[PDB]
Subunit: 570 residues, 3 copies
């Protein structure tokens, strides 16, 4: 006895833990993002039709590409079926059983595990939710319910009915029965036997193929455009009624569940067996900076290495996401994927308000927990060397590798006033008291960090990062949080890997540091391995900036090239 | 007995049918165009001096590079010699025999064939036109005729006379005879014996070489600049008179002909043994679009294939033609040639007025009749794939391969009013009645067409295209003409080969088509093989356009790159 | 007995002739220029610290990288030590012996040769200048002299004293002796024994290493920034006093010299064993033109050849010099070096005023006297071919190879009025009388010249060029000087190697030349090997210029690309 049930996701959303539930990113052919599960857009598929077919694209993809278990099923991502013996849970106005979020109790009480689902499907042909009555909604019957639909047009359903009549004359009585009935299964959520699934699939999609030739939309909006999926809900009933009229059919109606709070529990998988994982975070307004950075990474990439680039994007435009991927198209050793950074607000929480993008670095050990090591780099940078050699630096059981922050070194030396929830104090005292660093001199800059993810997973560093995030607001936000949590667990990278470009004036601050540090800064400027445009004067704005040619070099011959001229003509 | 006579052409112009007449494109080194015959600019040549030497560049090229027949001759492209027995044809005020155009009767009555020319040259040393008298023009003698010339300066002829005297003292009496005579052969049109041709060539060009050192032009205009050719007309007489004074010389004076109506009957020959012939048509204002297209063709070209690109140009600037060829300079497998599209107005005519560029596609089976198959593509496109795979599509005896026009599909479905000489009617009725298409749904788009030229040659499809062009004016011009003539002889290419970019709004028209067609349009947009910027909003104008990066990608790093910025700053 | 003494140079400056004196370009890591000697920036070095360590960078470099002779010494570039027996030369207010310039008498009287220096160091441990008294300057002792220093801060010297005390407790009495003394060796100029040099080096730089950690500058200016070098002058005395207190030490105090007139006598050495030496000259305002030229040279370079490019720069910006070198970074067969052209004013002089850049070509046989042949090219050019084939042209004992000047050919033919110190006369008479050219037609253009340097060295052509430069001012400056001196010693290059772009109007002047010359000009324009943008309308200014695309082609995808748009938007 084998069961495989598929859940349809369109954004980062919690996954069920049972191995028999397979999540699918439906409509992935139209998405530039990853959500942590395979898409419906591999092999023989109709993923691009998801705006119109809805979850039928998952149905189609499983039908054409999956090795079918003895039972094949489909559920929504926040709406599932109750497979447990207790079918007496409190239901509401719509007949659904509500549960706050997807947790271990949710999967236990609703029987969302292999053992409970297997006993529920024992000698049953089809499992599905309870019928819903159209007479309460004011409709006379199921046919009239389609016609009165706010976003429905009966001519589309009439066209589908004629096709069933022509292609399958033996269904005419089943069509009449459903259309004149006052109830039915208004759902695409079911579990049915392998042989019934194949027969229904061949039957349903033969009708839908002809339906595409028989109807034409008339300025349909997003809801009306789902006409195909809406029609398939009626065909589902016509098909079942025909099976019941022919002979036996054992149907088990189950309760429906609803999850009121969306969460995210997934993770990104590596795309190569061995690669240099590079993590960048920016919104649409910094997409130009991210393009130059990614182009700089490609230009200094080792031909014999692979590069797994993941952008934690905050509403980057579809155009910019397309342009960014197009930078990697000619390079099979360079992958670029996008993840909605805003999923981090609902992973383990601080119920105060905070920006997922502002604190994105804190979530690297969780999202990338399947990686051994990962290199984060600020988006306002360009590299002058292979980022892969950062992966070769021996880390031991240190949590991170990073560059010592010489700007903070100046803040401590010159008694710059800090600002946080603990008041206002010199930066040196702030580092010792608030950040609990016995040596404030070990403060590292967060513009480039090699995460020892494997060690963070063993120590559950992520839970500590969240705890520190909850406790108070810090002067330099996640940079302060990571300096506190990673203290005495930091490998120090040479200054060549994080060279400040100096803003408009580089001679005002750095020459007044410790002489040895100033010498290290002067030597690093002469052969940088990464240039950090940290500050107010960005190269995509003024041109009158140190290392400005290094930025232009990587933005020339990209779609952002002509943007820089207008964006610079103040 | 062998005869080879060469005709000098500088633009598309009719060729004589006899195999012994060899057409030459004189001054081809200064031209960017092909006219359908070899140039005077291969091997040892002086083609660039054609503005000054005139037809002497053809003389020089034959002298240095051709295997000389027993008789070598030269004629103009619309002025020839009468080799027939009848030398009594009606002549006019200037002593020329006029004939409307070059046809089969013209070549028959004036003996322009191998048999008649061979009997005319039997025991003759030199054949040439009748002498012309300078006394009727008001001149005292041949010397005075040069001095009184409107665009002549006697100091140039005096310089040439001194050179003949110094280099060839034995010519002094022949110089005096001609200069004091009142008549002579004012022509460069002759047929002479192989040995006389070589001797005259060595003699004439030895003088002209020294003449270049002895004269200097003084702000000469185009007519004055022909001083070398004008002087050679006098030297021709001095040379002949010397031969007659030394001993025997048998001269046969023939009548001159003139062709009052210029036509074109040539064809372009393949430049590779096997290649992908690509035909594009545009004027100078669309040269930027053509550059992006040609660059896109190069960028997606197969290294193991050859590409024979021919641009039917309508007064494209010399600068733009140079820039376009320079796109192919680094690619020995890509050829680019230009042909004046305006020659199509005088090929088989509709004596109404029409634009050669507007109807250029109709003339492809005639100009390219020596090709088996040819791919036409609109100039407002860019390709995303190798155009060579269009040549691999099985055509059978179909006349063309093209993409079904989904815009016309919408016009028929939505009863768009047509406009032609047959009035105003719905597009569906217009397609059935005016275009005689039993199924209006097979209407194909003309933005990319694989011509089965070999089949069109066998069926003489070109004559039918011209007949249909004469009959009436059509709603979509040559697209309608080709849909009518090619009906039921069309292989349908997948929509990926002609993807509309959608202008500024792509959601207004296409979603209201047949649902199956809209799905095909959505799938084709996701991986286009050719992008068609058909419509009002062109990417070289607004930037705010779908597939705009695909156009910029191919115009970047070309001489038109900075043009796009000023042309877009409205 | 072995002696090696090093002199510190920071700009083009005269070198001592004795083989035992080794010149060093100190701080070369911060310079983009060559001055004719090795730098302090190879191997283990601190060259970038030269703004702070001063000549200690030469000391450090010799210590870490040189095979030390029995005696190691250091002198300034215009201040040396008197090694001769006579130590009684007239000294001035500061105790230095002045000499006008570095000549053979200077090296003789002050014993700056191997023989005199060897006898001076016979049984001596350390040689150095006379002590200087701080009491005359108003100081109480050597400690107080540091504190009262205008650009000195005693806290820095106090920090160095504490380090000597901690690291070397045995020096406390030597520290007290020097600090309380009223005199000492305020110098970094010395010669000492090999073993004393190593011990002092390990001692001095161990202190300076710790000093970098113990001090921090406070908005120091250029003079204050030399704190390290200033402190080392005191440590030098502390170290010597300790050696004298421990036991024996034989010290020989020598007189100091000063050279009041700076000269230059060096030469550039080849960087490859075999290469194409290319010499260009421009200031910062023509750096854009030089970038396009150098890029054109790279684009047409033979992969199997090396290219030794030297720019005689006249205050080209640091940014532009960096951008120019960056053009060669991806090309290991192309070297780019810079030399300050202004050193030519002090090589052999005309004590009138003249511009080193205006007459830079005249100095090629002197600066490049170690090359066999050298190709000069104007900066307002782009090449269309490998410059290396100019080196293959047989020169014999001719002094130069160049292109005949057809513009001067027109000036002579049209009696253009010359202008020089000899008055105003037709150009033909000027060429014969002032330039002493029996045939004015052999006048060559100076925009591209192959110098036969080896022949010029044998004939001392440079001395003649200088003599002619002194005598009078010429119409076309160094072009006239070189035409006079190189007359009848010129190999004539084909016109394809120096094609005028024609300014805005090319049809006004050239068609009126000798006809043969005009034909040569028309043929050269059709396939140029070098395009000369000589004149008023430069391609980086107007766009409306012949061969404009040839210039843009080489400036596109460089940092000057966006400069051209603003510089052209008038
Ligand atoms: Mg940053
Ligand atoms: Mg570019
Ligand atoms: Mg078009
Ligand atoms: Mg010049």
């Amino acid at each position: 006895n084998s069961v495989k049930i598929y859940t349809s996701h369109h954004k980062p959303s919690a996954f069920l833990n049972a191995a028999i539930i397979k999540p699918l990113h439906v409509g992935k052919a139209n998405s530039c993002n990853e959500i942590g599960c395979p898409g419906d857009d591999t092999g023989d598929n109709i993923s691009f039709k998801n705006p119109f077919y809805c979850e039928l694209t998952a149905h189609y993809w499983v039908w054409k590409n999956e090795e079918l278990a003895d039972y094949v099923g489909f559920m929504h991502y926040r709406r599932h079926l109750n497979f447990s013996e207790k079918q007496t849970f409190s239901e509401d106005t719509w007949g659904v059983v509500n549960h706050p979020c997807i947790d271990e109790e949710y999967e236990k009480i609703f029987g969302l595990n292999e053992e409970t689902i297997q006993r529920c499907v024992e000698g049953i042909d089809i499992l599905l939710p309870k019928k819903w009555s159209v007479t309460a909604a004011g409709s006379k019957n199921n046919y009239d319910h389609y016609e009165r639909g706010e976003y429905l047009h009966i001519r589309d359903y009439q066209a589908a009915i004629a096709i069933v009549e022509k292609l399958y004359p033996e269904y005419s009585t089943a069509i009449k029965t459903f259309n004149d009935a006052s109830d039915g299964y208004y759902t695409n959520m079911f579990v049915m036997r392998k042989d019934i699934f194949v027969d229904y699939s061949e039957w349903l999609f033969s009708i839908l193929d002809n339906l595409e030739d028989a109807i034409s939309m008339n300025n349909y909006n997003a809801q009306e455009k789902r006409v195909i999926g809406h029609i398939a809900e009626r065909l589902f009933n016509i098909y079942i009624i025909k099976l019941q009229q022919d002979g036996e059919l054992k149907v088990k109606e189950l309760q429906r569940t609803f999850v009121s709070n969306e969460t995210f529990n997934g993770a990104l998988n590596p795309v190569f067996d061995s690669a240099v994982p590079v993590v960048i975070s920016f919104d649409d307004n910094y997409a130009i900076s991210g393009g130059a950075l990614i182009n700089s990474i490609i230009r200094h990439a080792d031909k014999n290495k692979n590069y797994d680039i993941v952008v934690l994007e905050n509403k980057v435009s579809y155009l910019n996401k397309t342009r960014l991927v197009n930078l990697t198209s000619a390079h099979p050793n360079v992958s670029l994927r996008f993840f909605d950074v805003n999923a981090f607000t609902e992973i383990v929480h601080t119920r105060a308000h905070f920006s997922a993008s502002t604190y994105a670095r804190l979530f690297i050990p969780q999202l990338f927990r399947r990686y051994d090591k990962v290199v984060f780099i600020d988006s306002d940078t360009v590299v002058k060397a292979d980022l892969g050699e950062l992966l070769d630096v021996p880390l031991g059981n240190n949590l991170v590798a990073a560059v010592k922050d010489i700007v903070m070194e100046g803040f401590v030396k010159f008694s710059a006033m800090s600002a946080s929830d603990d008041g206002v104090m010199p930066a040196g005292e702030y580092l010792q008291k608030t950040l609990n660093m016995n040596n404030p001199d070990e403060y590292f800059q967060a513009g480039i960090i090699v995460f020892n993810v494997k060690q963070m997973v063993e120590e559950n560093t992520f839970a500590e990062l969240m705890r520190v995030l909850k406790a108070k607001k810090y002067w330099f936000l996640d940079q302060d949080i990571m300096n506190k949590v990673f203290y005495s667990r930091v490998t120090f990278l040479p200054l060549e890997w994080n060279v400040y470009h100096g803003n408009g004036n580089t001679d005002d601050f750095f020459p007044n540091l410790k002489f040895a540090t100033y010498m290290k800064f002067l030597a690093a400027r002469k052969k940088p391995k990464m240039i950090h445009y940290a500050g107010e004067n960005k190269p995509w704005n003024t041109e009158k900036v140190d290392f400005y040619d290094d930025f232009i070099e990587n933005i020339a011959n990209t779609p952002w090239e002509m943007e820089i001229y207008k964006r610079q003509m103040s």
